[PDB]
């Protein structure tokens, strides 16, 4: 079964573990490119009472940098939110905890906004379908394709 963290029936403490960024998308495409603070490659996630813990790594050169985010449950059900590069919120439209995840976060800083949307697998790759249906979401979100980044081939340090 699947689930959305602002659902009723969610479970956080199944989305514990090791993660893999599949896809990444933004209607700041530069976010997520090459060298984008954004272009972040999630490798587990530590599910605590009211925050996150997320371990990423970022890449330059084939050269990985860790780097970790607490976040907290904000006063939204399935919100959470944390500090990083200005000021962000994210909640997990869907997920069926065993295979996909897909996350939905908003950024604010200095005034400016932008929207960062991905696909995470439980393992380094995920079905076509899927990755279709996340393409999908992000059209509903305003992302076009041209601003959909596949990191499956590139995720691996």
């Not at 944390?82 to 069926?96: A, E, M, Q, W």
């Not at 996340?134 to 081939?153: K, T």
Request: proline content about 1%; glycine content about 6%; some cysteine.
């Amino acid at each position: 079964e699947e689930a959305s963290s602002t659902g009723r029936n969610f479970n956080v403490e199944k989305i514990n573990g090791e993660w893999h960024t599949i896809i990444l998308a933004s209607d700041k495409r530069e976010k997520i490119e090459d060298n984008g603070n954004f272009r972040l490659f999630l490798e587990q996630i530590h599910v605590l009472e009211k925050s996150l813990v997320l371990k990423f790594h970022t890449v330059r050169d084939e050269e990985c940098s860790e780097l970790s985010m607490v976040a907290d449950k904000t006063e939204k059900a399935g919100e959470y939110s944390v500090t990083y590069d200005g000021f962000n919120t994210f909640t997990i439209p869907k997920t069926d905890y065993d295979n996909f995840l897909m996350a939905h976060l908003i950024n604010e800083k200095d005034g400016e906004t932008f929207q960062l949307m991905g696909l995470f697998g439980r393992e380094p790759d995920l079905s076509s379908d899927i990755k279709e249906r996340f393409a999908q979401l992000c059209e509903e979100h305003g992302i076009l394709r041209e601003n959909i980044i596949d990191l499956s081939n590139a995720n691996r340090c």
